[PDB]
A and B are shown apart, each in its own frame.
Chain A
Amino acid sequence: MNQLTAILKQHTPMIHFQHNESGATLRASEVKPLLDKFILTKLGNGDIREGRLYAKKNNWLIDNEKNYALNYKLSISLQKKSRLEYLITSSTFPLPTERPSNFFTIQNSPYFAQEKCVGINTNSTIILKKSNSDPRKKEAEFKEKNWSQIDKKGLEWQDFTIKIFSLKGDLINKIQTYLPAFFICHNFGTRNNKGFGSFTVEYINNQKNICNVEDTLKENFAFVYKKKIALSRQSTLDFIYIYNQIFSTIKKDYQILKSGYNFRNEYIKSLLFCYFVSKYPN
């Protein structure tokens, strides 16, 4: 076959700079180069150069001397256009009362950019306001234009399509073999290393994909570390609450890693600090 029409699932919201289009989805400008690098790395059994020689012998390269690019066509299109749009900040703020259904807030997140849009500024998406009954407990208001003019939005869509076209059948077979591992290993977006890129592939060519996440992670990464987070009941309600817990936990742990936590009242030292002051204590 010359076409690969895969249906993939979104696990965590994607931060997208070109969100003003209703057709905003995964950008193949990130997928295709990273997928080429991953595919050539797998071809050489861990080495990029050996995989490049492999693709050179099989004529899968656009150019045999300059670049890493493989010859195929990547297309990512939305099936259903409904999007769940998220606001991503670094601090926690009172939620608005008047609020569109698409709008949800992941307030305590690793993504700390655009922190000023939850300020008192007139350019802030959610304008904070003093409360009248209590001279504390800030009030929240929503500005439609400000939410429309935001640089980056966190987006979640339903199942959509990634289409891979090539006239070289063997490349398509190897792409079918390695695509679940690629998506299980790589994240796409802004601050994607912190988790705003998580995707999994469900149907490859109208066939379910039984790909174990643990085994692929074990294969393609030096260390893989699982954490079982206490899913307090729910699990059928408030995916927004699930996202809040997940990203607050990520912020917790990663702030613990390379820094401390001088927050409320509990102190735990930076493990990045504690590593160097212990090993060769200089």
Chain B
Amino acid sequence: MPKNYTLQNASNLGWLFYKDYYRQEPNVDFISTQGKESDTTADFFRKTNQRITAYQLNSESPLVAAFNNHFGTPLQLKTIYPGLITGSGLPHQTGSKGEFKLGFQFDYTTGLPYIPGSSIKGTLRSMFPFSLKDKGSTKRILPEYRKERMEYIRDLIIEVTNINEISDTEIQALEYAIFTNSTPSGKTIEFSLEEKDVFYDAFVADSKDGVMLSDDYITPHGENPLKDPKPILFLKIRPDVTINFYFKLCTTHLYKEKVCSSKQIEEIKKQNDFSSSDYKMITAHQKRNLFEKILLCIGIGAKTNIGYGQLKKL
């Protein structure tokens, strides 16, 4: 019900978008071909879309406060205006006019728009060199891919932490420890429970003075420039919206070219043979800085090559 999405007086956004969206009213038709194109159906879907994009989120919202309590301190970023699109491939269309033809990612329980942690993990890993599997259809792309990603991640690591030199093996071990929580060659490392990188679900945290959802058009003009283009309507997260990124990251210890846990690294330090030139460390703060720089560089969501889901610092 109107603005200020709260746990007390508000309809579930996912329920409105997916379940209540295609509800049958006494005098609304979208089964026959005439009904889908009629202005009665357009008005029905316009009212539904207004209800969807008539909700605000306060900064001190109890939902976001609960998220902060559960998932630790958030990494807050802002939305540029292409908007932000997540879950675009979900099936949501009937062939009608004025309806949202693209899917959207809504949390089931809360209804707040969110980015699943899997999307964050994949986007962050995509700029790491070992995000591509050998397979055999990758063989040609694999050498160049790893090279450019190695250079990019090397400059990022030298930027964010006080390490003046890193190697390809060290980058491999760091990436595998961060994402797979293992070693590049299979076998695992005896990590502590705390020493584990978790990528929670990014959530909408603050729609300052406006709504959080907007409606946008992509109009693919066909390969025949003499035929009529297709207006496609979808739902986007509004620009200048605070998206909270929640992570559970640890400190990574790299001695020589291998990743070490804290228990192993204590004994390695206490050994009579040691080399500060071989012991590298990436603090959880520097890990968060690295992830923030990656997110600023590439962004999150769908249609990111078109620009959707790019961020600045808040």
**Residues of A bordering B, CB below 8 Å:** 2-3, 17-18, 21-25, 27-29, 32, 59, 62, 69, 71-77, 165, 167-169
Q: Which residues of A contact B297 (CB under 8 A)?
A: 3, 165
CB within 8 Å for A72 and B305 given contacts A23-B240, A29-B218, A167-B149: yes
Q: Is the CB of A32 within 8 A of B216?
A: no
B307 contacts the other chain (CB 8 A): yes
CB within 8 Å for A59 and B298 given contacts A23-B239, A23-B240, A29-B218: no
Distance A165 CA – B148 CA, assembled complex (angstroms): 13
Distance A168 CA – B152 CA, assembled complex (angstroms): 11
Smallest distance from the beta carbon of B243 to chain A beta carbons, Å? Answer: 15
B306 contacts the other chain (CB 8 A): yes
CB within 8 Å for A75 and B144 given contacts A21-B239, A23-B239, A28-B306: no
Q: Which residues of B contact A28 (CB under 8 A)?
A: 82, 306-307
Q: 1/0 contact trace for B130-149 toward A, CB 8 Å? A: 00000000001100100011
Q: Which residue of A lies closest to B140 (CB)?
A: A59
Q: Is the CB of A75 within 8 A of B307?
A: yes
Q: Is the CB of B141 within 8 A of A74?
A: no
Q: How many residues of chain B are within 8 Å of chain A by beta carbon?
A: 28
**Residues of B bordering A, CB below 8 Å:** 80-82, 127, 140-141, 144, 148-149, 151-152, 214, 216-218, 238-240, 297-299, 303-307, 310, 312
Distance A3 CA – B298 CA, assembled complex (angstroms): 11
Q: Which residues of B contact A23 (CB under 8 A)?
A: 80-81, 239-240
CB within 8 Å for A59 and B144 given contacts A17-B217, A21-B238: yes
Smallest distance from the beta carbon of B225 to chain A beta carbons, Å? Answer: 12
Q: Which of A27, A73, A167 touches B304 (beta carbons < 8 Å)?
A: A73
A-B contacts besides A21-B214, A74-B305, 18 pairs, CB < 8 Å: A18-B81, A21-B81, A21-B238, A21-B239, A21-B240, A23-B80, A23-B81, A23-B239, A28-B306, A29-B306, A29-B307, A32-B306, A32-B307, A72-B305, A74-B307, A77-B312, A165-B298, A168-B144
Q: Which of A62, A69, A71, A77 touches B80 (beta carbons < 8 Å)?
A: A77
Smallest distance from the beta carbon of B170 to chain A beta carbons, Å? Answer: 20
Judged by DSSP, the binding face of A is loop
Q: Which residues of B contact A76 (CB under 8 A)?
A: 307
Q: Which residues of A contact B312 (CB under 8 A)?
A: 77
Give the residue among A25, A76, A167 with the most B Cβ atoms within 10 A.
A167
Distance A92 CA – B303 CA, assembled complex (angstroms): 41
Distance A62 CA – B299 CA, assembled complex (angstroms): 18
CB within 8 Å for A32 and B305 given contacts A2-B148, A21-B238, A23-B81: yes
Q: Which residue of A lies closest to B148 (CB)?
A: A167
Q: Which residues of B contact A72 (CB under 8 A)?
A: 305
Q: Which residue of B lies closest to A36 (CB)?
A: B305
CB within 8 Å for A75 and B80 given contacts A18-B216, A28-B307, A69-B305: yes
Smallest distance from the beta carbon of B59 to chain A beta carbons, Å? Answer: 19
Smallest distance from the beta carbon of A67 to chain B beta carbons, Å? Answer: 10
Q: Which residue of B lies closest to A169 (CB)?
A: B148
Give the residue among A2, A3, A25, A69 with the most B Cβ atoms within 10 A.
A2
14 contacts between A and B (CB under 8 A): A3-B297, A17-B217, A21-B81, A21-B238, A28-B306, A29-B82, A73-B304, A73-B305, A75-B80, A75-B307, A76-B307, A77-B310, A165-B298, A169-B148
